[PDB]
Amino acid sequence: GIKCFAVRSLGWVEMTEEELAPGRSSVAVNNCIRQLSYHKDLLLQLEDETLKLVEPQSQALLHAQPIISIRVWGVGRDSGRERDFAYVARDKLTQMLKCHVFRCEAPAKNIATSLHEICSKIMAELE
Numbered sequence: 698g699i700k701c702f703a704v705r706s707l708g709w710v711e712m713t714e715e716e717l718a719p720g721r722s723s724v725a726v727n728n729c730i731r732q733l734s735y736h737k738d739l740l741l742q743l744e745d746e747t748l749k750l751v752e753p754q755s756q757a758l759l760h761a762q763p764i765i766s767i768r769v770w771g772v773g774r775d776s777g778r779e780r781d782f783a784y785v786a787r788d789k790l791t792q793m794l795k796c797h798v799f800r801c802e803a804p805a806k807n808i809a810t811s812l813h814e815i816c817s818k819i820m821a822e823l824e
Contacts, residue, residue: 736777
């Protein structure tokens, strides 16, 4: 149900399509985390198959990514980057592919895991 995570936005980095061909992808996302994360506050929310960025104090939807069009996600593969979450979606207005990095309070695998979970019950659900 309402899975909600304390995060900070660190920024984003433009990506190409060839960067996103598989296993040139996972590598690439990590450079994206490498670029923006050094080793205010948002709630990155998961509900209704939507990755939501919510202003904590106000409960005000800041941004809203349909999960199904997230190209890829990740956690910072190396050391210390266990709290770094990244995802990649085409930007709705400009049409750009972007990798958004977030530094989380709890471990970034909790979010990876909730995303898999939400995807899997949409795969097995579409039958």
